[PDB]
Amino acid sequence: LKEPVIVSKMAARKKITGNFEFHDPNALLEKLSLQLGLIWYFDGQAIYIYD
C-alpha cells in the first residue's frame, strides 16, 4: 500500500502471528477486516483504521 496506515490505540491491543503475503493488498485488507473485526477508510492521503 502506497499510503500510511493509522490504527487507533484500542485496536492496537489485539495480537497476530503468521506468514502473510502481500501482492494485491486492497483485496487482502478487506477480507481480513471481517475476520478480525475492523473498519477502515482511505481519504486520499492516509488509511485510517478503527475497531
Binding site: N19, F20, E21, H23, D24, A27
Partner: peptide
Amino acid sequence: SFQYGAEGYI
C-alpha cells in the same frame, strides 16, 4: 508450512 494472502493459503 503455508503462507496466506488474498486467495487462501499457498
